[PDB]
C-alpha cells in the first residue's frame, strides 16, 4: 500500500547511503596514506571504484524507477544506464576474481610472487579488466545487439516512458558467462588451492610443535570471502539463464529482487576486503 | 692494574676544572635565545612570500 512504497524508498535510500559511504571511505583511506598504497590495494581500490560507480549511478536510478513505476528520462538515458549497470557489475566481479588470483600467486609461489607483480603490471591488469568489462556492456548495449525481436520487447523499446530489460539468448548467455561464471570457476579453483596450502601449513605446524600448546580460521575467512559473493550473485545469474531459455517462466519482480540482492554485494564488499588492522586504523584516524 | 691507574688519572684531570654557577649559565642560554629569536624561521612563522619551500 502507501506505507509499502515509503518503506521501499527508505530502504533504497539507506542502501545508497551505505554503499556511497563505505566505498568513498575506502578510496579516501587508500588515497590519503602512502602506507596503504600496495599492489593488491590497487585491485582493492579498483573494486571500490566500481562499487561506488554502481551505487551512485545504477542503484539510485533503479530505485527511482521502481518507486515511480516508469522511466521519466529519455530513451538514450535508459540504454546508457543499462550499460553503466552492466559495466559496473562486470568490473566488480572480475576485480574480485583478480584479487583472488593475486592471493593465489602470493601463497602458491611465494618466491616468484614478489617479482612478477609490479605497479606497472597491476595498472595493466586493472586497465585490461575495465576494458573487458566495457566491451561486454557498452559495445552490445549501445549498438543494440542486446535487443531481442519480441512483441513485448519491441513495444517496450518504442515508448520512452518504459525502460525494462529484454535481451536475446546470445547476449544473455555471453554476458552471464563473462561476468559471473568464468570468475566463479577461477575463484573456486583459486580458493581451493589456497585452502589446501593453509591446511598443509597447519599440519606442518602441528607436527613441528604438537606437544607444546602453540582449520577454523581459514574456513571462516573463506566463507566470509566467497559465500557472500556466491549468495549475493548466484541466484540472479541462475534466474537469468533460466528465463532467457524461458522454459520456466520467471516473474519480473523475482528478477528485480535478485538483481538488487546482487547490487547490495557492492556495499557488502568493503566489510569483507577491508578488515585489515591498517585499514581499521586508517578509518579510525579519518573519522573520530 | 694499568687500566686502574689510567682511570684514576683521567678522573683526576676532570676533577681539576673551574665551574661557574648555574645561574650564570642559565642567563647566558636565555640571553642567546632571546637575542637570536628574531632570526629563527622555525620558531616564528616566516611569511609565505619569503618561505623557499612553499
Amino acid at each position: 500500500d502507501e506505507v509499502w512504497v515509503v518503506g521501499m524508498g527508505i530502504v533504497m535510500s539507506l542502501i545508497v547511503l551505505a554503499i556511497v559511504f563505505g566505498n568513498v571511505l575506502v578510496i579516501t583511506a587508500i588515497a590519503k596514506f602512502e602506507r596503504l598504497q600496495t599492489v593488491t590495494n590497487y585491485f582493492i581500490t579498483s573494486l571500490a571504484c566500481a562499487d561506488l560507480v554502481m551505487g551512485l549511478a545504477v542503484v539510485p536510478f533503479g530505485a527511482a524507477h521502481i518507486l515511480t513505476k516508469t522511466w521519466t528520462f529519455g530513451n538514450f538515458w535508459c540504454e546508457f544506464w543499462t550499460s553503466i549497470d552492466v559495466l559496473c557489475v562486470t568490473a566488480s566481479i572480475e576485480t574480485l576474481c583478480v584479487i583472488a588470483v593475486d592471493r593465489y600467486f602470493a601463497i602458491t609461489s611465494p618466491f616468484k610472487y614478489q617479482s612478477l607483480l609490479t605497479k606497472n603490471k597491476a595498472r595493466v591488469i586493472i586497465l585490461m579488466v575495465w576494458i573487458v568489462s566495457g566491451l561486454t556492456s557498452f559495445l552490445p548495449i549501445q549498438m543494440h545487439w542486446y535487443r531481442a525481436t519480441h512483441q513485448e520487447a519491441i513495444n517496450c523499446y518504442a515508448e520512452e516512458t518504459c525502460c525494462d530489460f529484454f535481451t536475446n539468448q546470445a547476449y544473455a548467455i555471453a554476458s552471464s558467462i563473462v561476468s559471473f561464471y568464468v570468475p566463479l570457476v577461477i575463484m573456486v579453483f583459486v580458493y581451493s588451492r589456497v585452502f589446501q596450502e593453509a591446511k598443509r601449513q597447519l599440519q606442518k605446524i602441528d607436527k613441528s610443535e604438537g606437544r607444546f600448546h602453540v582449520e577454523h580460521k581459514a574456513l571462516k575467512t573463506l566463507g566470509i570471502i566467497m559465500g557472500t559473493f556466491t549468495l549475493c550473485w548466484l541466484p540472479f545469474f541462475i534466474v537469468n539463464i533460466v528465463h532467457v531459455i524461458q522454459d520456466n517462466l520467471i516473474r519480473k519482480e523475482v528478477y528485480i529482487l535478485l538483481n538488487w540482492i546482487g547490487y547490495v554485494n557492492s556495499g557488502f564488499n568493503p566489510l569483507i576486503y577491508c578488515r585489515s588492522p591498517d585499514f581499521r586504523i586508517a578509518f579510525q584516524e579519518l573519522l573520530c | 692494574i694499568a687500566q686502574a691507574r689510567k682511570l684514576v688519572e683521567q678522573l683526576k684531570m676532570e676533577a681539576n676544572i673551574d665551574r661557574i654557577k648555574v645561574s650564570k649559565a642559565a642567563a647566558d642560554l636565555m640571553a642567546y635565545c632571546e637575542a637570536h629569536a628574531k632570526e629563527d624561521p622555525l620558531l616564528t612563522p616566516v611569511p609565505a612570500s619569503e618561505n623557499p619551500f612553499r
Binding site: 618466491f111 609490479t118 593453509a198 601449513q201 610443535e209 573463506l222 | -
Partner: protein, 233 residues
C-alpha cells in the same frame, strides 16, 4: 632555465636506474647467520657456499644473500637486520659440558631468548641448526658426563610421542637430541604470537643438503607470512 631541464634529465635517469635496482633488490632475499662462536658457523657457511662476511648462493633460480657478522654480548647492530627473510641460528648441540664457567648450551639458550624477545627482531623467523650431531652422539653413547648432571630437567624428560628417528639411531642419543630440541622449542613457543616460528634441524658436517632445508624453510616462512597477512591462518 637550462638548470631545470638538466636536473629533470638527471632525476629521470637516476629514477630509471633505481627502478632497475628495485627489481633486482626485491628479487633477492636476505638471511642473517647468527650463532655462537666455535659452533661450526664457518663450516656450515662454507657448506651453503658450495668486518662482515657476505656470501650469495642461489637455488631453484632464487637468489639468497647471507651476511655473517664478527664483537660483544651487547647487540645494537641487531636492529639493522629487521625485515630479513630468516635468521639462521647455528648451535653446537654436542657442547652440553663445556666452559664458554658457564655451559655453552645454556649460553646459546640465553642468546636465543634474547633474540626471540628483541623488539626489533619481532616477526622474524629463526632457522635453527643443531650442528655437530655426530659429536653429540659419540658423547652420549659412550660413558661421559650425564645430561642430568648439567641439565636438571633431563631426568624427568621422556621421548615425545612423535619419536621421529633417523634410519639408524639409539634410544639414548634420540632422547638427548629431542631434549635439546624441545629446550629451544619451549623457549620459542611461549613468547611467539604466530608471527614468527622456529624451524629446528639436526645437521652434521658430513651432510651437504642444507641448501634444500634453508630453501624449504624460507618458502614456508614466506607462505606463512602471506597466509597470516590475509587472515587465513
Amino acid at each position: 632555465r637550462n638548470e631545470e631541464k638538466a636536473q629533470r634529465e638527471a632525476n629521470k635517469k637516476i629514477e630509471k636506474q633505481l627502478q632497475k635496482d628495485k627489481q633486482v633488490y626485491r628479487a633477492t632475499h636476505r638471511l642473517l647467520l647468527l650463532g655462537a662462536g666455535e659452533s661450526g658457523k664457518s663450516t656450515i657457511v662454507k657448506q651453503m657456499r658450495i668486518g662482515i662476511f657476505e656470501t650469495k648462493f642461489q637455488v631453484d633460480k632464487v637468489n639468497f644473500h647471507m651476511f655473517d657478522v664478527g664483537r660483544d654480548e651487547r647487540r645494537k647492530w641487531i636492529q639493522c637486520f629487521n625485515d630479513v627473510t630468516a635468521i639462521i641460528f647455528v648451535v653446537a648441540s654436542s657442547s652440553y659440558n663445556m666452559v664458554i664457567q658457564t655451559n655453552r648450551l645454556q649460553e646459546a639458550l640465553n642468546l636465543f631468548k634474547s633474540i626471540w624477545n628483541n623488539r626489533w627482531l619481532r616477526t622474524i623467523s629463526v632457522i635453527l641448526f643443531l650442528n655437530k650431531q655426530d659429536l653429540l652422539a659419540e658423547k652420549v653413547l659412550a660413558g661421559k658426563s650425564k645430561i642430568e648432571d648439567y641439565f636438571p630437567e633431563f631426568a624427568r624428560y621422556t621421548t615425545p610421542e612423535d619419536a621421529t628417528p633417523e634410519p639408524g639411531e639409539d634410544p639414548r642419543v634420540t632422547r638427548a637430541k629431542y631434549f635439546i630440541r624441545d629446550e629451544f622449542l619451549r623457549i620459542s613457543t611461549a613468547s611467539g604470537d604466530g608471527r614468527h616460528y622456529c624451524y629446528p634441524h639436526f645437521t652434521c658436517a658430513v651432510d651437504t643438503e642444507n641448501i634444500r632445508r634453508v630453501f624449504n624453510d624460507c618458502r614456508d616462512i614466506i607462505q606463512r607470512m602471506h597466509l597470516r597477512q590475509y587472515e587465513l591462518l
